[PDB]
Structure formats: structure tokens, C-alpha cells
UniProtKB/Swiss-Prot annotation:
Native organism taxonomy: Eukaryota, Metazoa, Chordata, Craniata, Vertebrata
Keywords: Activator, Cell junction, Cell membrane, Cytoplasm, Membrane, Nucleus, Phosphoprotein, Repeat, Transcription, Transcription regulation, Ubl conjugation, Wnt signaling pathway
Statement: the UniProt record of this protein carries the keyword Transmembrane helix: no
UniProt organism field: Danio rerio (Zebrafish)
Protein name stated in the entry: Catenin beta-1
Quaternary structure annotation from Swiss-Prot or TrEMBL: Interacts with adnpa. Interacts with cdh1 during oogenesis and in the unfertilized egg. Interacts with ctnna1 and cdh2.
ARM repeats: 15-54, 99-138, 141-180, 225-264, 274-305, 306-347, 353-393, 395-430, 452-491, 493-532
Length: 550
């Protein structure tokens, strides 16, 4: 022994087959001792069988006896002695560490009993209990399908109230292995209060391995249209946001994904300061994923929510995003969400006008109008056109935006997109249907037509004839922006008569009976401009026409 392994071998071999055969000679007996009625007798047996599992030799023996196993399982779920349980359970634990054992316990029906063991008030018991289950869920085939039917989920979620970190991890991981790619399970975890339970963990412990394992569960639930809003109410967003800076990259990445899967719902949450603020930071991270997800989340959280829009602006959201776009490049996987954010951050909220100037002070206009041209794809373009529009609300961008050659492109896109909606008659593309490109562009020109010089350019491209045709569109929104752009242009005699000679008088006169506050207005607006400076006769019947018909 104190020499080499040449001696240890004869020892390991002499005692292995030794204690090994001892079991094959006692297993049958002990088996009976368990089935025995006398309670005190079974107890002793359980303690002996457990002392045998410890030994490898004896272990395989117990692990190969379908009768001995089934006996242990049975005894464990029917025993009312804290020691018999901890031993019977502990035994099954030392057995699960082996493929044969798992198969055995699985064949002897241990999962069910084990599940029922999770309800046990005894700690040690619960430990070995959940553990053995974890092993079966990882290596035992069909084990999953089984645990579910045994109502483990609920019992497992209930255990989430414990305090042992390393224990919580094991349990949570189970809730993960059972939920992944399974709606039923996910629903059950929902009908068990899992969400609020899980969240509490993320907002209470610091055990890295736990948080991760916990977030994972949330990730698999964030995909569910049922748990998604549920995870939100519990305040999951805020919770997850409390780890976006953690050193464990895997933890941060998981929190990010889960967030993006809930962002399109938490648009009505309060106390997002930390999150929103932190997300802005991530926009400056080195990892593309971090930046992307960061952008995506912001984009969603900034969609219709002034409280969020203003905050993002009070943390450098614009500058941050502007750099994100100027950093992304062609990777529309980053520009699209980034641009959308800016769009949301440039409309419907006090500090809107602020950001509008911001996008310019940080040299964003050049890169914004830039995205209007190839290789940029329709989805990006649509989102971009929207941004430009709002950016046009600020007269300080009129000139700077016009110099970037935005009007020419917008008009062009309008033409083609429109000519496309015309050939579709005698209609989606990459997801974005041209009809949407028409409204945006025109609407972008309507707002951008507030500058005299811009109007000279817009008109110069001979667009008057087209905008008139759009008045015949079956889509209100198009008519609105259509009659709108004509309105801003109608304030100039030349363009005024230009629109009249185009035959806009007839159609416009009708849009007065439109069930759209705007349409009618703009429509009437152009009419007035045209007839302005005509015989005192027509303009008189004109003033009546407007007062009577509306």
C-alpha cells in the first residue's frame, strides 16, 4: 500500500468483490425487512441499505435489483419517520449518480414519490429529493414527461420560498428544464405564482449561479404571451435591470434578452429610472449584442410613454443613440431599433423639441438622411423617414436637413413606392407595404414644407401633379398628408395656381365632406388660397361653401 498502485489494486480488488458479494447475499433479506410491517424493523433496514449505497460494490448490487429499488421508493413515500425518509431519500440520491440507478428509480416509480417528497417539511430530505429529481431531469429519458404528470412544477415553485441559495438554484434549474419548449409547464408555473416568486429572488440574493439560473427561467417565460405580462406586473423589468452591470456576462446577457421580450409590454410601468438610465449606458458597451439589445429595449420602452422619453433625454439618450447609429454602420440590426428610439424621442412629450435640436447638435442629420439611401432596407427606411419628419418639426433643422438632400430622396421614394401601389392594382415588401412609405414620405414633406426654400425645392421636383393624385387615395392618412403638403405650398401664388390648373379644385372641394378634422381643414385651406384674388363673386360663394357644407 505504501509503495505503488500495484498493491492498491490487489486491495481495491480484494475488498470490492468482497463487499460486492456481501450485498448480493444481504440485499434479498433487507428487501424483506423494508416490506415488513413492524415499523421499527423497516427503519433499521433503511439505515442498513443506505449504508450499503455508500459502498460502490454494494451500490451496483442495490442498483441492479428492481425489487430492492421499488421497495426503497415505496418505503420512502409511505414512511412517517424523519430518519427513514432522509435515509430512503438519501439512498436514492447515491443511486441517481449512476445511469443504471436513474433507470432503476425511473422504472420503480420514484419520480412520483420524490415529487411528493418535495412537500416534506424536513430540509435534508428536500435536498436529496430535489437533487435526485434534477439528475433524472438531466439524464433520465422520459423523466421530464413523468415529473410533469406528478405535479412537480407546483411543488417545485412552492419551494422557491426557501433561503438556501444552492438549493434555490437546483430547484429553479428544474423549473427551467421543465418549462423550456413546453407551454403547459410554463402555464402551470404561472398558475403557481412562479413569476412573482422568481422576481423576488432576482431582487433579494446575490449568489451569481442562482440569479443566472433564475433569469433563465424568466427567459423561457418571457416568450409566453401569458407569462410575459405576468413577469411585468411583478416588476421583473426593474428586477432584471438590477444586474445589467454584473460581472457575470452570461447573467447580464440573459437579463437583456428577457427584457426585450417584456419591453413591448412594460410600456406602462413606473420606476424605470434605473433601468432606462442603465440601458443608455450599455449603448456605449463594446459587445455588439449588449448595444443591440440595449437599443431594442429602449426603442420599446420609449414607444408611447412621455415619462420614459423625457428621462432618456435627461440621460443623454439622444447623443448616446446618435452615436449608436453612427457606430452601427450598415448593420441595420442596430440602426433600426436605434432610429425608432430617436423617432419616439422626438415627438409627443415636453422635451421633444429639445431632442429635435439635439439630433443635430451631435451631428446626426448627416447620418440620418444617409440611411434613406441603399443598401438600407425598407424597414429601416420607414423608421428613418419617420425620424426625419419629427426632426422637421424644428425649424432649426429645415436648412441643415435640406442641405443633406433629403427632399430629393423623400420625393423619389414617394414616387417609386407610389408607382408601385399603382402597378399593384392592374401588396407587401420585406414586411413594409409601400402604402406606408407613401404616407411617411408625404407626411415628412408636409412638415418639411414649412420653410419657404424647402417649398421651392419640393415644388421644383415637379411634385404638385402627384400630390394632387394622392387626394384620390382610399387611405385617409395619405389624403391628410397629401392635402397637407398642398396647403403649405398653396400659400404661394405661383404654386397656388399651379395646383389649381392641375385640377385640384374639383377634388379638394369634396374633401370638405371628409370625416377627418384634418383632411377637411387642409382641403379647405388649399381652396381658399387658390380662389384668393379671384372675382369678388366666386370667393363670396366660396366663403359660404365652407361655412355651409361644414
Amino acid at each position: 500500500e505504501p509503495s505503488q498502485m500495484l498493491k492498491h489494486a490487489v486491495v481495491n480488488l480484494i475488498n470490492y468483490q468482497d463487499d460486492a458479494e456481501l450485498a448480493t447475499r444481504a440485499i434479498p433479506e433487507l428487501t424483506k425487512l423494508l416490506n415488513d410491517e413492524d415499523q421499527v424493523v423497516v427503519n433499521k433496514a433503511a439505515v442498513m441499505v443506505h449504508q450499503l449505497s455508500k459502498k460502490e460494490a454494494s451500490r451496483h448490487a442495490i442498483m441492479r435489483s428492481p425489487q430492492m429499488v421499488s421497495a426503497i421508493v415505496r418505503t420512502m413515500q409511505n414512511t412517517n419517520d424523519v430518519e427513514t425518509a432522509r435515509c430512503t431519500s438519501g439512498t436514492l440520491h447515491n443511486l441517481s449518480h449512476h445511469r443504471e440507478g436513474l433507470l432503476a428509480i425511473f422504472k420503480s416509480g420514484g419520480i412520483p414519490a420524490l415529487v411528493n417528497m418535495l412537500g416534506s417539511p424536513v430540509d435534508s430530505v428536500l435536498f436529496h429529493a430535489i437533487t435526485t429529481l434534477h439528475n433524472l431531469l438531466l439524464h433520465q429519458e422520459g423523466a421530464k414527461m413523468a415529473v410533469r404528470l406528478a405535479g412537480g412544477l407546483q411543488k417545485m415553485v412552492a419551494l422557491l420560498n426557501k433561503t438556501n441559495v444552492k438549493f434555490l438554484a437546483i430547484t429553479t434549474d428544474c423549473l427551467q428544464i421543465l418549462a423550456y419548449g413546453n407551454q403547459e409547464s410554463k402555464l402551470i408555473i404561472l398558475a403557481s405564482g412562479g413569476p412573482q416568486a422568481l422576481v423576488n429572488i432576482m431582487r433579494t440574493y446575490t449568489y451569481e449561479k442562482l440569479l443566472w439560473t433564475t433569469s433563465r427561467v424568466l427567459k423561457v417565460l418571457s416568450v409566453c404571451s401569458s407569462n410575459k405580462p405576468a413577469i411585468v406586473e411583478a416588476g421583473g423589468m426593474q428586477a432584471l435591470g438590477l444586474h445589467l452591470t454584473d460581472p457575470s456576462q452570461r447573467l447580464v446577457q440573459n437579463c437583456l434578452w428577457t427584457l426585450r421580450n417584456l419591453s413591448d409590454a412594460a410600456t406602462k410601468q413606473e420606476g424605470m429610472e434605473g433601468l432606462l438610465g442603465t440601458l443608455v449606458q450599455l449603448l456605449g458597451s463594446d459587445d455588439i449584442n449588449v448595444v443591440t439589445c440595449a437599443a431594442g429595449i429602449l426603442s420599446n420602452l420609449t414607444c408611447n410613454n412621455y415619462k420614459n422619453k423625457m428621462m432618456v433625454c435627461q440621460v443623454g439618450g439622444i447623443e448616446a443613440l446618435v452615436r449608436t447609429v453612427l457606430r452601427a454602420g450598415d448593420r441595420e440590426d442596430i440602426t433600426e431599433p436605434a432610429i425608432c428610439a430617436l423617432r419616439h424621442l422626438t415627438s409627443r412629450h415636453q422635451d421633444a423639441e429639445m431632442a429635435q435640436n439635439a439630433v443635430r447638435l451631435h451631428y446626426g442629420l448627416p447620418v440620418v438622411v444617409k440611411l434613406l439611401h441603399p443598401p438600407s432596407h425598407w424597414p429601416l427606411i420607414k423608421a428613418t423617414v419617420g425620424l426625419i419628419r419629427n426632426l422637421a418639426l424644428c425649424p432649426a433643422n429645415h436648412a441643415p436637413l435640406r442641405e443633406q438632400g433629403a427632399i430629393p430622396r423623400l420625393v423619389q421614394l414617394l414616387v417609386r413606392a407610389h408607382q408601385d401601389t399603382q402597378r399593384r392594382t392592374s401588396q407587401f415588401v420585406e414586411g413594409v407595404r409601400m402604402e406606408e412609405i407613401v404616407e411617411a414620405c408625404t407626411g415628412a414633406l408636409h412638415i418639411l414644407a414649412r420653410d419657404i426654400h424647402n417649398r421651392i425645392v419640393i415644388r421644383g421636383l415637379n411634385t404638385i401633379p402627384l400630390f394632387v393624385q394622392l387626394l384620390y387615395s382610399p387611405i385617409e392618412n395619405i389624403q391628410r398628408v397629401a392635402a397637407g403638403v398642398l396647403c403649405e405650398l398653396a400659400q404661394d401664388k405661383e404654386a397656388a395656381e399651379a395646383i389649381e390648373a392641375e385640377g385640384a379644385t374639383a377634388p379638394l372641394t369634396e374633401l370638405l365632406h371628409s370625416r377627418n378634422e384634418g383632411v377637411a381643414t387642409y382641403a379647405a385651406a388649399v381652396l381658399f388660397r387658390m380662389s384668393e384674388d379671384k372675382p369678388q363673386d366666386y370667393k363670396k360663394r366660396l366663403s359660404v361653401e365652407l361655412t355651409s357644407s361644414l
